[PDB]
DNA sequence: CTGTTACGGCTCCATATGGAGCCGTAACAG
DNA sequence: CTGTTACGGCTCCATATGGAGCCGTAACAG
C-alpha cells in the first residue's frame, strides 16, 4: 500500500527515497524549477507507461515509439498511470465534445429506442456521424466541407504570374527550375497562351485550367535540367487540387494550407453532420441535432422535467440515468456552459483538461494512478470547491491522485503533502518536509508552511494609482459572446480583467486588442477581431505579449545571447592582451561563425551516431570534449577563466564575477532579479521550460531603456508559480509599472488581483449568458458591488 | 469487487448477463467455437484497452490505431487488461531473452558496481550495447553482420544475365520496359560489355561493379516507355546495395529478403555484441558474455555459490537479491533449459508466452486485470503444479486471472468456474452454469461437469495395433541439440512423440523429417536439416501436414468450394428443367465467373465507401443485397430454395436436405463427423478461427480415397480443444490409422497418449542436457521404465 | 557610449509492377 | 462415374527544395 521510491537521480534530484501512500489525495509542492513536476512526470508516470507499453503487444510499442527508462534505481507498488496535464491537437473533424465525453452514443440509443418519427427501421447505428448509413452524403459527415477561396489564390490579380501571383508555398514559380515553374511553361505551351497576360486579361477559361487541372487531359510535357532532359506524358491536376492532395495526404502544414482556405457550413444539413432524413425523428419536439446544441446546464434541465410513459420509462431508465449523472459530472467540473456540438479543435487549455477529467470520472476505471498538473489553473476561485469534491468523488472510487499544485484551497483539503525544496535547481532537489497539513505548518523549515501560516504575505498597498487621463477605449467588441460591449482601460497604470470562467475576457483580449494593437504598430499580418473602433492608437509606440511560448528551437541559442549580455562578454574578452597579441577579434569568441567554434561538431558541440536498426543517438564530441571551442580559442583567459569556464557559470556567479563592469552588473542583477539564478549562461533554450522561458523574457523587458509608451500583454503569468513566486512576479510587475508603462494581465489569483490599479469584470456567467461588463473602477471600488463573486471575494480578502 | 457485465452481443453470445467476482482465479470453459475466449478477448480486453488507450494521449492512440468498442451495453468495474496469449513476432535483434526479462540491466549494474577490471571509469551504461559506448564498432552491438552470398545471387552462373540468373524478386530483367532492364542496358552500354556473354566468361570487375555499383561513378542513362523518352545522370548503387537499402528501410518481404542473406557471426567479438575493452571486468573468473551464454539454471546455481566480502555484500545485496528472484521466477515458470544470450526471434508461442508470463510477475504491477489463453499449453504435465503455484503468486499480489482453460488440473486450483454451451455457435452462447468446482460437479446440466465426475470418458483400447514390418529410420539426426541419436518409427500405426519440454522433439521432426518428405516426394524447395540418411522413403506417396495455419487469405473461398461439395451441387443445380430450358452452365452457378456473379459487386458482395478523414469502411452491396447473385441466377430453384438459401445453410441442415444424393451426403457426413455442424457453407476463410481450419483439413483429408500409403504429420492438434472435442480427434485419428495411413502426433495430454500405438519418448530432461531417447515402444512397455516421467505418469493413468 | 534599423548568414522542419495462393476447367487414365 | 494433373484466370500484399526564426554585423542618430 505504498509507492517506494529509492534513488531518484532524474534531473536534479538529490538521491531522494519517498514513501507515497496508495489510494489518497497527494499534493507534491515545490518553487518553480525545485524538482517536483521533474520527480512526478518524469519518473512515476514514465515508468508506469514504459511498463504497461511493454506489457502490451510489441507492435503497439514501436507505434507509440521507445520511451527512454528513467535514472531511478526500483520502483516497488506501481500501478498504470495516466497524465493529465494542459495539451490541446488538432485532432479530426470528426471529433467533438459529445463524442469525447461519451455521450453521443447513449444519444444516439436513446433516440433509437423510445425517439419516434414523423422507409428503413430506425437503428441505433443510423444516427452516428461516422457510419455511411446516417451520414451526410454531401458533407460526408463532416458538416463543413473544406474549400480555398479563389480571391486568396492570388494576392494581386494584376499582377503577372512570375510578379509574385502565387502567395501559397509549394506552387511558386520564382525558380526558373522548379518543378511549378516547368508545369507553368508546359501549360502556356499546351493553351498557347502568354505569361505576359495576367490573369484579370486572361479568359477565364485559362484561369480555371490552370486552378483546376486538365480535368483528365493529357498532354506532353518537357523538363529541364543542369544536364538532363526529356519528355513525358501526364495530366495537370491543379494548383487547387494538389494542394488538397496535399493536405489530405497528412501540424504547423496544416496551419498554413488552412490559413488559405475557409471552412463554409454544408448547404444540404446545414451542420447537422446528419442525413436529412435521420432528423425526422424527434422527442419532445426536439431532433438529435437541436438537443446537440443547447448548453449542458439547459439539456440536462431538459432531460430532468422530461416527461415518458410507464413502458418508456421502462425501456429507457438506464440511459437516462446514466445520461443525467454524466451531465451532473459535466457541471460539477466547471463547465456548465458548453455545448455538445463544439468542435473540439477550438478548445483551450483548461478546458481540454476539465473535459478529460470529467471523462475520466464517467468512465469508472479503478486501480489506476492518476497524475494531475494544476488542475485549478484557468478556473475561478468560485468553482474550487465543485473542483475538489470533483477530485474527492474520483479519488473515492478506487484511485489514487498525485496532484501538482499550489493552491492555498487544495492544501487544507489533501490528505498528504510532499514538499521540495529549499531552492531550486542545484539548490533544491531535497524532501525538506512531508505530512499532513498540520505538521508542514508546525515545521519551520518548509518553505510552503512559513506562507501558510502567516508568517510571510503578500501586503496589499495603502496607495493606489490614479489615471492620468490618457484612455484606450474598445467600441463595439462583438466576438463570439459579446455582446457589443465597450470597455475603458487606462493606461499608466497596472489594469487586471477578472470574470467568471468562460466570460469571454480571454477571446476578448486576445482575438481583438493584441491583434489590432500589433497590425496597426508592429506592422504584422495577422486577422483581427469583429470590432467597430478603437481609441488610443497613438498613445502607444509598440505592443509586446509575454507567454510561456520557447524562446528557441534551435540548440544554438541560450539565454546569455538571448539578453545580449553575450556581446559585451565577448567585447572584454577580445579587448584583453592576449587577445590584442593575437590579432583577435570579438567575433573569434562565439560559436556561430568559422574561426573559433570546434571544427568537428560545427560549433553545436554534439556529434551524431547513427545504428542499423536504432534512431540516431546523440553523443558528446571527444575532440573538444563538449567545450563548443577549440583549443587555440580556450587558450586566452581573463581573470583565471576561459570563454567556456563563463559559459558553464551560474547567475549568481557570474554576478559575483563581473562585480567591477557595471555595463553587465546591470544585466546579470536584472536576471537575478526575475529568480533565475540557479540557471547557467549555456544551458540550451530547447531545455528551458515554460517558466523559465517567461522569467528570461521578463528579464529582457526589464533590461531594455523604457520609453513611457509600452504595452505588455500577460495570459495568467502565474501558471506554475508558487506563492514566493507569486510575490516576486508583482513585485517585477508593480516594477514595469513604475517604469511609466501599462500593464494588462487576466488574472484568477486573488494575490495577484488585491494588488492591482484597474479592474475590469466581465460576467456575470459564463457563455451566452455573459459577455457583459459587470463592475469596474478600483478593487476598493468592486468590492462594494453586491450583485458580483469577485467583489464578494475581494471583500473577504479586504 | 464485481466486473458486472450485461448485454453482451459480441459474435454469438446470446445476451448474456454475467458477475465476475475481482481479485480472483477464474476460469472461463467452454467447447471450441461456444463463444468464451469470443467473451473474454473479444469483450473485456477490448473494452479495456480501448477505455485505456483512449484515457491516454491522442497521439499515442493514432500511432496504436483505431479499436472498434464492443457491442455490449455498459461494464461495471474494469480495470486495464493485458492479455498474454500465443503470439510471436521478428521484433528487432537488439531484443534478446535477457533484456526482454529485465534481467541484463542489473547484470550491467552489477558488472559495473562490483566487477574488477584487468583507460576510462567503469560506467554502467558503457556494459549496455544499445550505446555507442560500449557497442562493438565493427558490429554496431548487433553481433551478427547480415550479408548475402554472391552464390545465391545467381542460382546458374552459366546462364547468361536474361537466362534467369536474377532469382531476388524486384530486380529480374525479363521485363523489357522494367526499371532493372533499363539499368542493366545502360551500365552494358557504359561498360561497353555484351548482355550474350554469361558471368563465368565475363571480368570479375564487370561482375563487381554491376552488384556492388559504380562506387558514386555518376554516368548518362537514357530511359525509353511507350510514348516518353529521356535521358538523365545517375550513380548505380548495384543489385546488392539496394537490396540492403530496402531491407533496412522496411514480414513476408522481410522473410523473403533473409532468405537470400546467410547471416554470420561478427569476427571481432565472436558475437559478444560488446567492444574488446568491455569484456576485461570479470567476476569470479567470468566476464558478461560467458555468464549470459550459460543456461538459466546454472546461472542461478553460480550465482547463489558466489561468495563476496562484506564490502560487496553491502553495496550488492539490492541487486542480488533481485537477480536472484527474477532467476528463481523463470526457474518456477519452467523455463530452466533457456540461454540468457538466445536471440528472442527464435522463439516458439509457448516460450515466449512463458517468458511474458515471468516478465509480468516480475515487474509486479498491480490492480490490473490479467487475461491468459490456455497458459498449460505447449508444457509437459510434470510441470502443471509449478505453472499453478506461479499463476497463484501472480494472483495473490493484488491482481485477478481470467485464464481460459480445459485442463482437468487447472479446475481444481480455480476460485470460481464460469462454463458456456451446450454446444458452440448458434446452439451455445449461454451461461448454462458457474460457481465452484463442486457445484460444478453436482449440476447435471454443466458439460464440462459431466467429464469431470466421471460420466463420460475415454476408455482405453484393449487391443493394440503391431507394427508391419515397414519401418522409417533416421540415422544421425545431429539439429540443434540433438546428441546424434536414431529413431525408428513403424508405418500403419498412430504414433505418439512425447518428452520433457525443450527436448528436441518438435526441432528432430519439423525442421528434419517433414521438410525431407516434402523435398522428396511434393517437390518442394526447403532446407532440410542436419541429418545424415532416412530409410523407407519408397514406402510413401506424400506426405501432409495438418495446423491452424489460414485456409485463405481472402474472401472468395469457403469451406464448401474448398472441400470440393460445390462442384457437386451446382452440377444439379445445372442439370434441373430450368437449366436446361434456359440453356444454362454449371458454371454460371459460381461467384467466381462473370456471368452469374453480381455486376456491382463483383461477385464479392461487400461495397467499399470511402470518406475523408476515416478509413474505408465496408458495406454490404445494395444491388444484390448480399446475396453475390443477380436476379437471373436467383430465379432457378431446387425443391423449394435458391442458391443464395443453400451457401446460407448449415451443415446440419444440408444434411438433412441432401439425404436423397449419396454423392454429396459422404462429404456432408464426413463434415459433420469432426463437429462442423454449426458452421454454414457460406462463411468466409478469413472469419475462420483456428480449429475450424484445421478440422477442415481433416474433413478434407477424410473424404479423400485413402491409397494406405499416406503420413500425417500433426502438431500439438489438442490446442485449444475440450475434453469433448479431444474425444472426437481422437476417434477421428483411429479413423484414419484403420484407413490404411500412419499418423505422428506430438502430443502433451494424456488422454491422447493413452490411446497411442506407439510411442517415442525424448528426453531426459530439456536443453543440452536432453535431445537423446529414453524408452520406445507400447504404452504399456513405456509405462514399466522407471527413469521416464512419461513412463511414471502412464503407470497412474493406466 | 548606447540604442535602433537594416542586411547577410545559418539552421531545422515540412512536403506503379511483381509474386504467392486459390478457383475453375480441359484432358486423361482407372 | 471418379480421381489426378496441367493450364489459365483472378486477387491481395509488398517495395530533393522551400520557408520561418535567430544570430552576427554594418550603418546611423542621440
Ligand atoms: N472557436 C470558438 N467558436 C465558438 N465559440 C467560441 C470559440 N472559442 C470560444 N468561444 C466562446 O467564447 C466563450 C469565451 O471564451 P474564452 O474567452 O476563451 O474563455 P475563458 O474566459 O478564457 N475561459 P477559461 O478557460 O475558463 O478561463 C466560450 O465560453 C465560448 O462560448
Ligand atoms: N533457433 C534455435 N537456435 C538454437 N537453439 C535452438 C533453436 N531453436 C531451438 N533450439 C534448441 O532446441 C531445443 C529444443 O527445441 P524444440 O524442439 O523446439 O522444443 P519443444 O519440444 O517444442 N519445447 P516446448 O515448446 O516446451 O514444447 C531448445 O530447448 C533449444 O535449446
Ligand atoms: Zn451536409
Ligand atoms: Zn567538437
Ligand atoms: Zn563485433
Ligand atoms: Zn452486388
Same mark, same amino acid.
Given at each position: 500500500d505504498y509507492i517506494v521510491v529509492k534513488g531518484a537521480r532524474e534531473h536534479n534530484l538529490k538521491n531522494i527515497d519517498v514513501k507515497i501512500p496508495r489510494d489518497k489525495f497527494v499534493v507534491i509542492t515545490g518553487l518553480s524549477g525545485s524538482g517536483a513536476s521533474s520527480l512526478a512526470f518524469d519518473t512515476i508516470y514514465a515508468e508506469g507507461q514504459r511498463r504497461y507499453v511493454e506489457s502490451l503487444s510489441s507492435y503497439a510499442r514501436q507505434f507509440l515509439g521507445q520511451m527512454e527508462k528513467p535514472d531511478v534505481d526500483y520502483i516497488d507498488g506501481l500501478s498504470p498511470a495516466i497524465a493529465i496535464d494542459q495539451k490541446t491537437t488538432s485532432r479530426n473533424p470528426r471529433s467533438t465534445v459529445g463524442t469525447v465525453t461519451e455521450i453521443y452514443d447513449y444519444l444516439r440509443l436513446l433516440f433509437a429506442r423510445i425517439g419516434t418519427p414523423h422507409m428503413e427501421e430506425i437503428t441505433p447505428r443510423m444516427f452516428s456521424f461516422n457510419n455511411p448509413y446516417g451520414a451526410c452524403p454531401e458533407c460526408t459527415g463532416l458538416g463543413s466541407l473544406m474549400r480555398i477561396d479563389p480571391d486568396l489564390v492570388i494576392p494581386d490579380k494584376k499582377l503577372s504570374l512570375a510578379q509574385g501571383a502565387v502567395r501559397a508555398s509549394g506552387w511558386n514559380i520564382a525558380n526558373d527550375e522548379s518543378y511549378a515553374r516547368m508545369y507553368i511553361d508546359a501549360l502556356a505551351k499546351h493553351y498557347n497562351?502568354?505569361?505576359?497576360?495576367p490573369v484579370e486579361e486572361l479568359p477565364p477559361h485559362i484561369l480555371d485550367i490552370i486552378l483546376?487541372?486538365?480535368?483528365?487531359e493529357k498532354i506532353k510535357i518537357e523538363y529541364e535540367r543542369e544536364n538532363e532532359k526529356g519528355t513525358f506524358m501526364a495530366s495537370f491536376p491543379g494548383i487547387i487540387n494538389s494542394m488538397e492532395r496535399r493536405y489530405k495526404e497528412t501540424e504547423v502544414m496544416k496551419q498554413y494550407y488552412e490559413n488559405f482556405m475557409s471552412n463554409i457550413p454544408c448547404p444540404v444539413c446545414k451542420g447537422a453532420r446528419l442525413k436529412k432524413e435521420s432528423l425526422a425523428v424527434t422527442i419532445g419536439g426536439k431532433n438529435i441535432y437541436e438537443v446537440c446544441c443547447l448548453s449542458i446546464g439547459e439539456a440536462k434541465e431538459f432531460f430532468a422535467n422530461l416527461n415518458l410513459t410507464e413502458r418508456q420509462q421502462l425501456i429507457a431508465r438506464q440511459i437516462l440515468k446514466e445520461i443525467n449523472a454524466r451531465l451532473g459530472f459535466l457541471v460539477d467540473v466547471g463547465l456548465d456552459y458548453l455545448t455538445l456540438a463544439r468542435a473540439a479543435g477550438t478548445l483551450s487549455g483548461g478546458e481540454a483538461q476539465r473535459i478529460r477529467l470529467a471523462t475520466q470520472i464517467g468512465s469508472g476505471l479503478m486501480g489506476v494512478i492518476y497524475i494531475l498538473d /494544476?488542475?485549478?489553473?484557468?478556473?475561478?476561485?468560485?468553482?474550487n470547491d465543485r473542483l475538489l469534491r470533483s477530485l474527492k468523488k474520483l479519488r473515492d472510487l478506487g484511485n489514487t491522485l498525485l496532484v501538482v499544485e499550489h493552491d492555498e484551497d487544495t492544501m487544507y483539503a489533501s490528505d498528504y503533502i510532499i514538499d521540495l525544496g529549499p531552492?531550486?535547481?542545484?539548490?533544491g532537489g531535497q524532501i525538506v518536509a512531508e505530512g499532513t497539513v498540520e505538521e508542514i505548518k508546525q515545521n519551520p523549515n518548509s518553505v510552503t508552511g512559513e506562507y501558510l501560516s502567516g508568517r510571510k504575505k503578500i501586503e496589499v498597498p495603502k496607495e493606489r494609482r490614479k489615471p492620468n487621463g490618457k484612455w484606450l477605449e474598445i467600441i463595439?467588441?462583438? /466576438?463570439?459572446?459579446?455582446?457589443?460591449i465597450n470597455v475603458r482601460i487606462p493606461l499608466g497604470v497596472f489594469t487586471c480583467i477578472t470574470g467568471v470562467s468562460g466570460s469571454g475576457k480571454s477571446s476578448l483580449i486576445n482575438e481583438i486588442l493584441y491583434k489590432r494593437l500589433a497590425a496597426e504598430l508592429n506592422r504584422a499580418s495577422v486577422k483581427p477581431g469583429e470590432h467597430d473602433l478603437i481609441k488610443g492608437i497613438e498613445y502607444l509606440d509598440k505592443v509586446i505579449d509575454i507567454d510561456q511560448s520557447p524562446i528557441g528551437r534551435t540548440p544554438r541559442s541560450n539565454p546569455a545571447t538571448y539578453t545580449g549580455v553575450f556581446d559585451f562578454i565577448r567585447e572584454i574578452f577580445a579587448n584583453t592582451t592576449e587577445a590584442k597579441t593575437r590579432g583577435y577579434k570579438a567575433g573569434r569568441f562565439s560559436f556561430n561563425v568559422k574561426g573559433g567554434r570546434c571544427e568537428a561538431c560545427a560549433g553545436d558541440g554534439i556529434n551524431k551516431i547513427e545504428m542499423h536498426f536504432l534512431p540516431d543517438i546523440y553523443v558528446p564530441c571527444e575532440v573538444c570534449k563538449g567545450k563548443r571551442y577549440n583549443r587555440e580559442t580556450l587558450e586566452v583567459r581573463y581573470k583565471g577563466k576561459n570563454i567556456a569556464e563563463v559559459l558553464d557559470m551560474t547567475v549568481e556567479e557570474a554576478l559575483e564575477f563581473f562585480k567591477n563592469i557595471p555595463r553587465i552588473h546591470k544585466k546579470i542583477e536584472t536576471l537575478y532579479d526575475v529568480g533565475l539564478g540557479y540557471i547557467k549562461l549555456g544551458q540550451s533554450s530547447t531545455t528551458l521550460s515554460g517558466g523559465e522561458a517567461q522569467r528570461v523574457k521578463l528579464a529582457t523587458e526589464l533590461s531594455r531603456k523604457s520609453t513611457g509608451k509600452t504595452m505588455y500583454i500577460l495570459d495568467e503569468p502565474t501558471t506554475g508559480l508558487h506563492m514566493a513566486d507569486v510575490h516576486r512576479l508583482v513585485g517585477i510587475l508593480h516594477r514595469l509599472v513604475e517604469a511609466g508603462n501599462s500593464v494588462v494581465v487576466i488574472e484568477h489569483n486573488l494575490d495577484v488581483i488585491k494588488t492591482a490599479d484597474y479592474i475590469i469584470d466581465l460576467g456575470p456567467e459564463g457563455g451566452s449568458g455573459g459577455g457583459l461588463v459587470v463592475a469596474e473602477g478600483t478593487p476598493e471600488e468592486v468590492a462594494?458591488?453586491?450583485?458580483?463573486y469577485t467583489g464578494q471575494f475581494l471583500k473577504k480578502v479586504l
Open positions: 497562351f502568354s505569361v505576359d497576360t483546376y487541372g486538365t480535368n483528365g /494544476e488542475p485549478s489553473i484557468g478556473l475561478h476561485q468560485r468553482d531552492g531550486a535547481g542545484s539548490h463595439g467588441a462583438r /466576438e463570439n459572446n459579446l455582446k457589443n462594494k458591488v453586491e450583485n458580483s
